[PDB]
Design an enzyme around this catalytic site. Structure first.
Site, mmCIF file in Angstrom:
data_model
loop_
_atom_site.group_PDB
_atom_site.id
_atom_site.type_symbol
_atom_site.label_atom_id
_atom_site.label_comp_id
_atom_site.label_asym_id
_atom_site.label_seq_id
_atom_site.Cartn_x
_atom_site.Cartn_y
_atom_site.Cartn_z
ATOM 1 C CG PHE A 23 -1.843 -1.262 1.139
ATOM 2 C CD1 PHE A 23 -2.940 -1.286 0.293
ATOM 3 C CD2 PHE A 23 -1.556 -2.394 1.887
ATOM 4 C CE1 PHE A 23 -3.753 -2.407 0.224
ATOM 5 C CE2 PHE A 23 -2.372 -3.513 1.819
ATOM 6 C CZ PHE A 23 -3.468 -3.517 0.986
ATOM 7 C CB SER A 24 3.935 2.364 0.127
ATOM 8 O OG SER A 24 4.976 3.260 -0.196
ATOM 9 C CD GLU A 25 2.767 2.148 -7.981
ATOM 10 O OE1 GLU A 25 2.834 2.552 -9.153
ATOM 11 O OE2 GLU A 25 1.882 1.374 -7.575
ATOM 12 C CG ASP A 133 14.110 -3.416 2.836
ATOM 13 O OD1 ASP A 133 14.611 -4.558 2.780
ATOM 14 O OD2 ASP A 133 13.465 -2.898 1.911
#
Ligand SMILES: CC(C)(C#N)c1cc(Nc2nc(N3CCC[C@H](N)C3)ncc2C(N)=O)cc(C(C)(C)C#N)c1
Length: 274
Positions: A23-25, A133
């Site tokens: 739900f992030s681009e 990450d």
């Protein structure tokens, strides 16, 4: 501080997707008013339900702070159903492409890259952010030339620490493990842990079972190997912090060697990656 838009398309032309998350681009965007390019993180507010205020308060802090080695948060737009985090476009090239493309590459080059990542990650930790990450894909060069700094290109508001795999409570120390893994790959061109069998791989990471194997590590300094051992340490309590790693002679002193190790590192990057 937040700009309001009825429709983000009144502000930006969206081009290719750079990254897709949960739900992030992140999308390459051109500001219609100026022609300037940005990396825009597109987030549905429904995905933030229950934490919207908290996330906005954190973005409000970070919009005012620029770190030399982190993507700048240039602006925030709010539409009826989305948040848009307008980030600095880091356009200078990918990390492994640069190393392969170079004719000449030394421990001092690897040390210089790791020093910048340590600086960036120490700052994120102070602000209460655990990156979680850190990997080569998130490190991009600012510019195409040989003096370019490296930047953390993206952050949240094989490289995973043993304590995370063991489903144990974890801290900022997981990032220090990831930096050790990146340093390992930067000096030999292959990952420290890999097995076709996921169970065997899981166990090797959980036990921190890796080696500085010959011939790839034969012309690497004892200092580099000690630096990596202190970060790729199973016990997060014993593991170097970013602060401790930044004081190690391989970063702060003159122990990084000046030998051209490009031939072997570039051959291994080509062979070990897609
Ligand atoms: C358009 C281009 C040629 C330029 N200029 C370009 C720009 C970037 N830029 C960014 N990429 C990302 N992501 C992709 C990497 C992993 C990360 N999680 C999400 N996120 C932020 C930025 C930023 N801040 O610019 C990336 C790529 C490609 C996709 C080829 C790569 N790598 C190409």
């Amino acid at each position: 501080w937040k700009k309001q838009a009825e429709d983000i398309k009144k502000i930006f032309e969206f081009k290719e997707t750079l990254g897709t998350g949960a739900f992030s681009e992140v999308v390459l965007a051109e500001e219609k008013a100026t022609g300037k390019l940005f990396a825009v993180k597109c987030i549905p507010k429904k995905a933030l339900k229950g934490k919207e205020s908290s996330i906005e308060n954190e973005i409000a802090v970070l919009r005012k702070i620029k770190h030399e080695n982190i993507v700048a948060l240039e602006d925030i737009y709010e539409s009826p159903n989305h948040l848009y985090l307008v980030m600095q476009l880091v356009s200078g090239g990918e990390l492994f492409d640069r190393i392969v493309e170079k004719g000449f590459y030394t421990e001092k080059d690897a040390s210089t890259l790791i020093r910048q990542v340590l600086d960036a990650v120490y700052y994120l930790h102070r602000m209460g952010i655990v990156h979680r990450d850190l990997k080569p894909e998130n490190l991009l060069y600012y510019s195409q030339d040989e003096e370019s700094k490296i930047m953390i290109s993206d952050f949240g508001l094989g490289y995973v620490a043993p304590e995370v795999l063991a489903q144990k409570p974890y801290s900022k120390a997981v990032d220090c493990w990831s930096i050790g893994v990146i340093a390992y790959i930067l000096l030999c061109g292959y990952p420290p842990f890999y097995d076709e069998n996921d169970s065997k791989l899981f166990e090797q990471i959980l036990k921190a079972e890796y080696e500085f194997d010959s011939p790839y590590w034969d012309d690497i300094s004892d200092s580099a190997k000690d630096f990596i051992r202190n970060l790729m340490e199973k016990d997060p309590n014993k593991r170097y912090t970013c602060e401790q790693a930044a004081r190690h002679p391989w970063i702060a002193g003159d122990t990084a060697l000046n030998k051209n190790i490009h031939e072997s590192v570039s051959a291994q990057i080509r062979k070990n990656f897609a």
